[PDB]
Amino acid sequence: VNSFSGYLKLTDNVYIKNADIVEEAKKVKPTVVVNAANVYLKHGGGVAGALNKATNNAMQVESDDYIATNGPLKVGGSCVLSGHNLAKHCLHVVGPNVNKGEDIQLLKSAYENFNQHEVLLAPLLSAGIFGADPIHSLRVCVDTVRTNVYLAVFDKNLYDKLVSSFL
Numbered sequence: 001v002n003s004f005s006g007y008l009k010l011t012d013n014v015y016i017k018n019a020d021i022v023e024e025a026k027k028v029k030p031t032v033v034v035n036a037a038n039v040y041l042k043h044g045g046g047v048a049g050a051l052n053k054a055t056n057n058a059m060q061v062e063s064d065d066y067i068a069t070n071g072p073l074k075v076g077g078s079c080v081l082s083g084h085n086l087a088k089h090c091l092h093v094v095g096p097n098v099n100k101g102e103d104i105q106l107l108k109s110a111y112e113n114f115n116q117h118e119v120l121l122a123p124l125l126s127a128g129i130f131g132a133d134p135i136h137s138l139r140v141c142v143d144t145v146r147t148n149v150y151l152a153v154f155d156k157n158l159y160d161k162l163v164s165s166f167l
């Protein structure tokens with residue numbers, strides 16, 4: 001049993017809810033919140049901008065030190081950093097950004113990072129300002145992630161379309 005509340009069950013291991021991932025993280029304080037990161041960990045907008053703002057820019061400060069030491073992530077890759085006031089840990093995962101021409105096949109590799117964590121609160125990778133089709137992202141999620149994932153979808157219209165179109 002866990003504290004995630006009000007989710008629709010899509011599969012054995014994937015759950016979904018119309019929710020602001022920032023508000024959901026503050027309320028549950030999950031072991032892992034996933035950030036929709038880029039390779040430079042520049043958390044300017046979208047989910048990343050929102051999570052970073054909620055940490056009062058502490059996420060960005062930590063991220064800048066990470067990059068200065070380690071260099072950029074790979075598209076499809078991830079790193080574990082602090083969850084600050086939102087979670088124990090933040091898993092920064094880089095999905096391909098279609099508005100940069102990145103290969104959408106890398107979306108499966110991106111979701112594979114979730115399998116290293118038993119339970120996660122997460123957004124749909126490559127959705128929103130990353131330009132991919134969220135219906136496709138949900139399908140890849142369900143077909144790739146085997147651990148327990150609680151997806152937060154900010155837009156109510158999109159959430160309903162995601163639920164109503166789910167096979």
Ligand SMILES: O=C(Nc1ccc(C(=O)N[C@@H]2c3cccc(O)c3C[C@@H]2C(=O)O)c(Cl)c1)NC1CC1
Pocket residue numbers: 020021022023045046047048049050123124127128129134152153154155158
């Ligand atoms: O600002 C926030 N939260 C907060 C949450 C999410 C997002 C976000 O980018 N959402 C994206 C979105 C929007 C439209 C269509 C989409 O396919 C997607 C994918 C992604 C998602 O829904 O995961 C943002 Cl900007 C802010 N909280 C402060 C108190 C105000």
